[PDB]
Design a protein around this ligand. Structure first.
Ligand SMILES: Cc1n[nH]c(C)c1CCCOc1ccccc1F
Ligand SMILES: Cc1n[nH]c(C)c1CCCOc1ccccc1F
Lengths: 116, 114, 116, 114
């Protein structure tokens, strides 16, 4: 898949399941257009967000709904969300994995970018 | 009441002269400029706000990571790093937002103390 | 596999390939006995370290040879290695993934623990 | 010349009263005790060594993370967090080892300055 999101829970030592993720793409007029969305699976993964045709060059924002996740668990966290913003596909199509590792007051994120 | 600290995981150093913009969420859900500055030689940015001005609300701290890496001659992944949070009066009074930067990754934490 | 190690490179945005990993287990006499070893694949993964029979309860140390990795790449890093030390299987068999995300002066590690 | 800073990613606070042991690698490859202490109210441990004693070599900083979490009534994954590194005179002079703790994860960085 050209875009995959993986989310882990640093408190539980587990995938972060049922995490809402919203992806936006910056439009010609500088606003953030809704691009795709979904929820992580029981493995903490979200596949199927887009296609190689649809996933054209642009500036994309992957918003990971960490507060909704921590509060669905009955916990009060620090951040509203974790946002990951990046230019994609500007040297041709690539495959992107965005990983996030979550704690109530902290997160870390990395990208793995591969050329098919 | 608000401090930002930025570190460089490639060089093992403070991240110096990084632009940081702070925004407050307005009633209409847009982000309005609140505070900004450049990190110091110690990677810190102090003096952003005062207790009087830093009322409860949703704040966004945008760290211009892309320019930092480019100035070092390194191509990075992210446009910027964003830290978005609610300031809450029933919590401790001083907020430190720390970020640890790599070209394709970052870590951020909050230290909230009294 | 009951024990898997995944290593990522935060500088490259890629799996960390050809990373040596040594696993030790603490003996009755408090020394660190060699348990297993291997190298990460082109996906940054190392499988096949042990079997459920062999992977008994104990205190295990997963040593990730980060300095050898960064210097094989011609780079001078801060740490000698990254060590991950944990009690395993003390409530019965579990499956462990140890993940590490590497930079020259920093690393982060997490565990995912699942019950088969 | 050596400082250790420990933060808690669950509570958003310094990690207070954490035991830290520093070791120096001996000629025979064993680890010999060098310095130890407990983090302060600010999560910091200063006063470990002096410039005179902190010669080039391989050092290990062991942070007793398991006891910290247990005292909070949380079951953690790791026995401890280990940070192993070479002190090198041709590098800057002051080393700060920072660690950010969660029950099943930790992050560590080095800030080496002059
Ligand atoms: C370890 C870590 N991973 N991710 C983050 C975010 C941090 C904390 C940043 C290091 O904190 C320091 C704070 C003040 C001075 C020196 C320091 F190294
Ligand atoms: C170590 C780390 N710190 N911060 C981040 C972000 C990561 C990488 C997380 C990805 O790790 C996994 C990937 C697949 C399965 C299990 C895994 F733990």
């Amino acid at each position: 898949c050209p875009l995959m999101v993986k989310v882990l829970d640093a408190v539980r030592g587990s995938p972060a399941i049922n995490v809402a993720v919203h992806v936006f793409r910056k439009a010609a007029d500088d606003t953030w257009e809704p691009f795709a969305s979904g929820k992580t699976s029981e493995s903490g993964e979200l596949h199927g967000l887009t296609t190689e045709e649809e996933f054209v060059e642009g500036i994309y924002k992957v918003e990971i709904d960490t507060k909704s996740y921590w509060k669905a668990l009955g916990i009060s966290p620090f951040h509203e969300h974790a946002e990951v913003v990046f230019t994609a596909n500007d040297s041709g199509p690539r495959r992107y994995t965005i990983a996030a590792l979550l704690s109530p007051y902290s997160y870390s994120t990395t990208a793995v970018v591969t050329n098919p």
